[PDB]
Design a protein around this ligand. Structure first.
Ligand SMILES: [K+]
Ligand SMILES: [K+]
Ligand SMILES: [Zn+2]
Ligand SMILES: [Zn+2]
Ligand SMILES: [Zn+2]
Ligand SMILES: [Zn+2]
Ligand SMILES: [Zn+2]
Ligand SMILES: [Zn+2]
Ligand SMILES: [Zn+2]
Lengths: 156, 385, 185, 606, 353, 183
């Protein structure tokens, strides 16, 4: 069944010259994707947005989702704290940069609207223990310097 | 800090002369625990016959302590338990079925006859000897009827019904600053340890077998609580302990104790279940390896007291107590026994010899090194007396 | 899953507002490449503060979070950092890099303004992930201390000294090309 | 830099993983501030305590109440009991707070006891019957004396005072339950109660009859007491000493189970693996050979040969030529190995048997003995040049399992006989001075059963008595029980080791037979003969010896090296790890490396 | 008297013909003490004056044995503390004493229509707490009992089981010993304390190699022609690491009470002595124990309740390495700067004089 | 059948109690600081201000009163282990001395009420209630259970009575374990 396409590119929520997916209802500009594709170098065959590719990738199976997320945070085990973020962008949809309302509640001289415009009114441990000991040595030397400065003040 | 040595024979010291006293009540042996029950006051009668057929009555004074009254046993016990003791008899036992369970005198330590009588005799002996030690007309006080160190405050356990060691020691504490209680019985005297667990005027030193062995108490790490920390020495040993091992452990630890703690009065509990061929203990001591401890404690030359104890085979304990009283009057008794009424007990050689078995001594010098090092580490903190 | 917040000083928020005002009304677009890349910014950060931390754990966490910001910023640059206007600049530079035999690494061109953009967006990003309480709390603590250092060294690269000079101020006016293809000509 | 190495060192030392898992869990429990610091030091001392440098670096790097498991604390609401006579001191000194008990110090189930073998059980039963009879006798007498004195005092009055006389509760005595118990024992407890209250009410008519009844019962019980005293004494003499050896009833089953081949190689394997597993620690010096035997007295060997000859002449398992071959093999081997001149052996057997009133290889290849007895670069050059041993004094023997087990049996027998021959002087001087009192002699109080059959150690010497008795046992002239009892009463239960002096001799004879029935061991002993007869040798010759003997048995069998020192009469047995040094480890780089580069001369591998 | 005694016969009879066949082969000075024994009263404390059915043989409440106060109607039997109310043993009311069940049955005259009536009336009366009305009517139809946790709290935890008499058992109970009833039937003088024979205690059973002590690295089998050189190897009950009794200074073979736990385990209770308490939870199996591997490594706290991998936290050796070094390094620097500042304070305070 | 959902930490507390009163031979220190009357009063008082409708307040007070009455009529009957009945009985005796009847809501702490709740499923399943009242009572009880699970920080500390003092539990003497258990 052929569904209806929304005339707004959800990356910018505005109409224009755009193309849509075969399984996803919303359309996007040619330059709204990454990599932004030429309007004439069209993809061969059926093209889907990130969401439908993700859907056909997971086969709607939560076990596969958890498997890929776990082995991904294991691949990024060098940068572990960010891993749970890095895995999600591989499946999200791009949208224009609009800082949330939490930022602009400070100055009333700025106006915004639906147009989106603004108006003015291992060797690892070796290196790390090395850093540790060198900083501690520098700091204890500065502390005995503190004591010598105090004694020099007492030389009045 | 343990080191094995040989065992030279026992030699009496000429300078250490003491006026002894020997307490015996002519009825102590007429109270029968029961048919087969492993405790008999009868061994005190035999011990007495041996002691007096050697002509040892010319060397010491012989007394008869007045039995204790209900208002002096209670210097340790509670009054309901004392009253139960006074009332219970094998006929009214079914009448106190809720009290035989609370106080634990119905089957484990049963009621036989004259229980209160025998307890009164033993307590009187102990307390009277302790009092004669105080007023200064003696140095040793022998009593083979006392020494019931298993009896608790409101219950009997281990065939001990009146814990007369504690009544006597309290009678000693009424005048004496520091009392040291040397317990060379094979069992643990949990009564006299728990009863003086938190005090620094009484120091117990107990050389006992530890294992899955009655009373299951007395590890090396029990050095008292509160103000009585480091003032309770337990030396747990293994089976088969022999004369040279026991001597090489007992001599240094006791010299250290009396070197730092410096007691003013001693209570030696020379029980006789720590001998070879006994009925419940598992050690392998000899008659001379058990009297060496008494001779060593006597060598120090302070107010002393010998008490009875266990002993489940009567012949070895009778001969041991005879020899200990003998060297307590500064004579090494002849090994040929004279004629006594119970002569037919002492087969087959009819001499004063207790013979050790070839039991395997399982106390390796490394274990005793560890134990005595731990014990000296604890004892380091009992100096300022 | 939680409701976590990141205390950002109002000065950087004002910098964000004036950046949006420069890119929307007069449509002045940032210069590519910048004076200093983001690699240099984060390297100066970790090199200035790694020599002020005692324990190995603190330095491990510092370096881990810095490398994480590098990976995320150069990863998410194309999805959530840029407005509608510079998408044309993005695609032309992408095709240039494509004919230059190698793909682009977005940490090589952009600068601290896009990093502040991503940092200010970050709280909602954390909030939509299943990061547990202690992990996300560490995340936002690291980020907060970083942006405090950013506020401390705002002077070197944020305030446009000599504003009349087009080469010093990273904002350049667009020609009729972008004014047309931005609003749909 | 140095601490990654610490965690690697810890993982190496612990060796296992589960224990390393627990090590890391200790570390993490410390990390999150749950464990104290010195509690961590003490918890790690159980891990890195066998190492000194690692743990001292840990000490320098980390910067380093019911404590008795037997007692509880009761609240201050169980310390509230009447305690009438408790004065001010027995509150300050005694302890009411902490509590112990052998029902929860034993964890609700416990208290094993000793075993106390059957003979001590019968002895305990005898002592109990003795105590029972003695108790009843003494109690009856103790009531009879008081009843007698009150009867003698009550009859001297007139009928009036008799009619008004009555006894207070206790009869004026010090005990109150003795007479009650006695009369209830003898007098039909119901009738006992009525007669005891009759005695308390009016003694003048009831005391004489109870007194005479007690007298007749006392005399009856005393007759029974002596008639049982006989049997008590006889059984006590029967099973006294049998009950005083806790090892002697399980030595005929421990010397046959712990003297097999498996155990015999297992003790030396164990000391070997100890030497290696503890040699991994570098600070200790390199240990030398496994077992050490020392032979200070040489006269026991003739006694062992006498025992062997006695068995072989007695036994029927082998035929007479075989018997002679066994005898001569034993004689010549113990004369050659221990370097005892055969002429001195013959003089010793002369001195021995007169009071009772070719080479060894010639026997190895038995046909010879049958014929005889029917006839009646610069490196290697300079290495072999220096160090030539003249006047050889330290000999070696390379042996398979059979020679080793045979020499083991030999050393076992020698060590046991040397034990008793070291005790002999004192035990004989003691048994010579048995001060038996004639007061026990006349009353049949002493058991002369051991003296009547001559098994008692009369003032003749003890060691020779042991040898003679063991020979009589081997021949079958004396039962085992009586030899055992003689050794119990004679020395003590201290010489229990000689109960199997015939089975160990049979085993040594079986091994001396295997030592020439096999072909491989025969040839190994032949090589041993060829080396022993040599008076001078070199290391290369010793390597030739070792390789020639290893050529005999397979590459899976074990090999033992027996190093005999004649200067001090010593034996050192070495287990051979197949690729270990054929000679003992020296301390010199010179000797070691020149020995190995001279072994390099032979085409055999390193 | 014709009463047999322990000796086997009456006291007035010598040994029978059978006994004296297998136990055979084929002045004094105690006249005194009534002249030398003298009374002693020098003691200090001398002033002290001084359907024919049968009842059950187990308690109906706690299912044990003892003294039972029975009922006449039913074969049920109850202890004296397990009654409603618990009755004092001496002052026991005599007569026909019935339990609560029998009393309730005899009270309703064994007719259920009156039961409906009284239950309905009780519901009508207690209108204030109506939800708990019917409940508070049945509290008087059951004889008392003792509390046992229902099976859905004993079965949530797998290492916790009811003992013989309904007691706690937490896998640290060794076992019952039936082959030690066989040790009562013992196979000769080979003790259960494992003495006089230790070749098979210094030898691994399944492998065949030697059980080595962790502290000395020797299996001192000695030599059993010199048995004074064995050293009593015993294997721990959790990790199976065997120690000598001279190394773990214990002197016994733990056989009865619990399982012996090597000195190589991290604790299951601490007493930090601030004092604070436990850090280790229970093992909540039945597969409800969720494991969570954190994304944070060097700063996680999470408990003492971790699991090591190459709510149970998951953690690897690297994290423990880093947390430990973090701890000791920051502690070192903290105490260093503390002593530095305190000594400079002392200096500036002393020069002020 | 009826089913109740106890938090896992309350299950761990109940099993710890099973350890302490069974084979570790401890009893509860009575009268505890925080009893059942005080606990139920604080819960009913702090939850009362949640919902505005009168049905909620009426059901809250009705459940609390009914639960206190079931605690009274049930503690003695079926909520004491065998080891600790003598304590109860002794208190019972010490009540008859001063002519004040024993009602446990003021003396007995929260753990016996927890035992009551734990066994309440079978008590409910054995009577002849309907299906609605069972579920409403179970829901009220589960709200109480989550309240308690949030408040376990103050009620169920572990203090090792042998070490300092005033723990939730106390040790028993040998006389008590003789008469209570081995009667
Ligand atoms: K003390
Ligand atoms: K003792
Ligand atoms: Zn768009
Ligand atoms: Zn799509
Ligand atoms: Zn004893
Ligand atoms: Zn009951
Ligand atoms: Zn009934
Ligand atoms: Zn060891
Ligand atoms: Zn272990």
């Amino acid at each position: 069944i052929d569904f209806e396409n929304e005339d707004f590119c959800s990356a910018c929520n505005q109409s224009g010259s755009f193309l849509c997916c075969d399984t996803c209802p919303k359309s996007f500009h040619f330059l709204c994707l990454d990599p932004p594709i030429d309007p004439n170098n069209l993809p061969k065959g059926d093209w889907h947005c990130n969401e439908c590719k993700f859907k056909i990738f997971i086969n709607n199976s939560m076990a596969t989702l958890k498997k890929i997320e776990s082995n991904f945070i294991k691949q990024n085990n060098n940068v572990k704290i960010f891993a749970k973020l890095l895995f999600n962008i591989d499946s999200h949809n791009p949208k224009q940069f609009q800082l949330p309302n939490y930022i602009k509640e400070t100055f009333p001289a700025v106006k915004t609207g639906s147009r989106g415009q603004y108006s003015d009114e291992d060797e690892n441990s070796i290196k790390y223990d090395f850093f540790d000991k060198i900083y501690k040595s520098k700091m204890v030397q500065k502390r005995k310097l503190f004591q010598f400065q105090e004694s020099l003040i007492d030389k009045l | 800090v343990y080191e094995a040595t040989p065992f030279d024979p026992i030699t009496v010291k000429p300078s250490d002369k003491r006026r002894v006293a020997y307490f015996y009540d002519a009825d102590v042996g007429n109270y029968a625990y029961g048919a087969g029950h492993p405790m008999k006051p009868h061994r005190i009668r035999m011990a007495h016959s041996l002691i007096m057929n050697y002509g040892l009555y010319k060397k010491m004074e012989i007394y008869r302590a007045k039995p204790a009254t209900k208002q002096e046993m209670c210097q340790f016990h509670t009054d309901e338990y004392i009253d139960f003791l006074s009332r219970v008899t094998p006929d009214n036992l079914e009448m106190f079925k809720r009290e035989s369970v609370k106080f634990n005198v119905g089957d484990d330590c049963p009621v036989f006859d004259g229980l209160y009588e025998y307890c009164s005799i033993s307590g009187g002996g102990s307390m009277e000897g302790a009092a004669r030690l105080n007023r200064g007309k003696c140095d040793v006080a022998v009593n083979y009827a006392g020494g019931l160190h298993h009896a608790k405050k409101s219950e009997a356990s281990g065939f001990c019904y009146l814990n007369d060691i504690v009544l006597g020691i309290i009678e000693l504490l009424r005048y004496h600053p520091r009392v040291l209680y040397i317990d060379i019985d094979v069992h643990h005297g949990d009564g006299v340890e728990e009863a003086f667990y938190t005090t620094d005027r009484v120091m117990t030193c107990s050389f006992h077998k530890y294992g899955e062995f009655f009373p299951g108490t007395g590890e090396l790490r029990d050095i008292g609580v509160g103000a009585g920390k480091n003032y309770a020495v337990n030396v747990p040993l293994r089976d088969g302990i022999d004369d040279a091992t026991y001597r090489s452990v007992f001599e240094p630890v006791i010299k250290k104790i009396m070197e730092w703690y410096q007691p003013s009065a001693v209570v030696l509990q020379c029980g006789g279940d720590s001998l070879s061929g006994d009925r419940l203990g598992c050690f392998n001591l000899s008659m001379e390896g058990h009297a060496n401890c008494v001779n060593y404690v006597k060598s120090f030359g302070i107010p002393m007291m010998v008490v009875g104890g266990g002993g489940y085979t009567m012949r070895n304990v009778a001969r041991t107590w005879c020899f200990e009283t003998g060297l307590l009057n500064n004579v090494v008794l002849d090994k040929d026994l004279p004629y006594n009424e119970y002569y037919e007990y002492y087969g087959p050689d009819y001499k004063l010899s207790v013979r050790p078995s070839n039991m395997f001594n399982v106390n390796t010098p490394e274990y005793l090194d560890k134990v005595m090092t731990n014990i000296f580490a604890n004892l380091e903190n009992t100096k300022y007396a | 899953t939680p409701k976590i917040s990141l205390q950002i000083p109002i000065k950087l928020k004002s910098v964000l507002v004036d950046d949006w005002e420069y890119v929307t009304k007069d449509k002045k677009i940032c210069r590519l490449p910048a004076d200093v890349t983001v690699e240099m910014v984060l390297n100066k950060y970790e090199h200035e503060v790694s020599q002020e931390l005692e324990s190995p754990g603190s330095q491990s966490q510092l370096s881990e979070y810095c490398a994480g910001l590098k990976l995320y910023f150069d990863k998410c640059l194309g999805n959530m950092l840029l407005y509608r206007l510079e998408r044309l600049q993005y695609d032309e530079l992408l095709k240039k890099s494509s004919k230059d035999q190698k793909p682009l690494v977005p940490i090589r061109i952009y600068g601290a303004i896009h990093l502040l953009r991503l940092i200010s967006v970050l709280p909602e990003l954390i909030s939509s992930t299943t990061m547990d309480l202690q992990s996300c709390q560490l995340l936002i603590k690291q980020t907060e201390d970083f942006l405090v250092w950013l506020l401390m060294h705002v002077d070197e690269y944020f305030n446009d000294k000599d504003p009349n000079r087009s080469d010093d101020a990273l904002y350049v006016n667009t020609s009729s090309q972008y004014e047309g293809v931005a609003l749909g000509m | 830099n140095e601490e990654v190495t610490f965690f690697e060192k810890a993982k190496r030392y612990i060796g296992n993983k589960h224990l390393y898992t627990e090590f890391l869990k200790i570390l993490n429990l410390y990390s999150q501030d749950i464990l104290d610091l010195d509690d961590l030091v003490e918890k790690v001392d159980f891990y890195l305590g066998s190492n000194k440098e690692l743990f001292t670096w840990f000490k320098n790097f980390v910067g380093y109440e019911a404590f008795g498991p037997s007692y509880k604390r009761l609240p201050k609401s169980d310390t509230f009991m009447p305690c009438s006579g408790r004065d001010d001191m027995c509150w300050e000194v005694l302890n009411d707070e902490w509590v112990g008990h052998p029902v929860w110090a034993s964890e609700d189930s416990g208290f094993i006891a000793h075993r106390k073998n059957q003979y001590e059980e019968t002895l305990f039963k005898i002592e109990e019957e003795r105590h029972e009879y003695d108790f009843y006798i003494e109690s009856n007498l103790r009531t009879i004396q008081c009843l007698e004195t009150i009867v003698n005092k009550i009859e001297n009055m007139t009928e009036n005072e008799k009619a008004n006389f009555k006894l207070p509760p206790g009869l004026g005595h010090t005990s109150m339950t003795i007479y009650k118990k006695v009369i209830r024992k003898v007098y039909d407890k119901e009738r006992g109660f009525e007669i005891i209250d009759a005695l308390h009410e009016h003694p003048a008519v009831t005391a004489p009859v109870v007194l005479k009844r007690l007298k007749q019962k006392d005399e009856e019980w005393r007759r029974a007491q002596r008639e049982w005293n006989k049997v008590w004494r006889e059984l006590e003499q029967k099973v006294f000493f049998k009950s005083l050896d806790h090892l002697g009833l399980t030595f005929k089953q421990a010397d046959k189970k712990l003297l097999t081949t498996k155990q015999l190689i297992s003790e030396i394997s164990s000391i070997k693996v100890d030497q290696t597993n503890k040699k991994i620690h570098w600070l200790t010096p390199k240990p030398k050979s496994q077992l050490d035997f020392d032979f200070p007295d040489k006269n026991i060997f003739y006694d062992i040969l006498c025992l062997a000859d006695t068995f072989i002449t007695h036994t029927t398992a082998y035929s007479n030529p075989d018997k002679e071959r066994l005898k001569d093999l034993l004689k010549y081997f113990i004369s050659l190995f221990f370097s005892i001149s055969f002429e001195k052996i013959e003089e010793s057997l002369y001195s021995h048997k007169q009071n009772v009133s070719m080479s060894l290889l010639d026997i190895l290849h038995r046909s010879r003995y049958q014929k005889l007895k029917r006839s009646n670069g610069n490196l290697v050059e300079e290495a072999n040049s220096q160090g030539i041993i003249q006047n050889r004094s330290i000999f070696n023997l390379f042996a398979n399992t059979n020679i080793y087990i045979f020499f083991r049996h030999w050393t076992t027998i020698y060590e046991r006989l040397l034990e008793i021959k070291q005790m002999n002087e004192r035990v004989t001087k003691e048994i010579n001075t048995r001060s038996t009192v004639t007061f026990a002699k006349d009353l049949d109080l002493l058991s002369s059963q051991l003296s009547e059959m001559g098994l008692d150690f009369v003032g003749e010497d003890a060691y020779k008595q042991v040898l003679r008795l063991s020979r009589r046992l081997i021949n079958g002239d004396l039962e085992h029980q009586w030899f055992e009892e003689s050794l119990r009463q004679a020395y003590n239960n201290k010489a229990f080791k000689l109960y199997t002096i015939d089975k160990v001799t049979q085993s040594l004879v079986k091994h001396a037979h295997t030592l020439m029935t096999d072909a491989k061991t025969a040839e190994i002993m032949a090589l041993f003969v060829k080396d022993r007869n040599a008076s001078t040798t070199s290391a290369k010759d010793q390597i030739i010896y070792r390789l020639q003997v290893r050529s005999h048995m397979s590459n899976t069998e074990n090999m033992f090296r027996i190093e005999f020192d004649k200067r001090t009469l010593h034996v050192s047995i070495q287990y051979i790890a197949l690729d270990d040094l054929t000679l003992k480890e020296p301390k010199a780089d010179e000797d070691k490396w020149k020995y190995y580069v001279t072994s390099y001369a032979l085409p055999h591998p390193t």
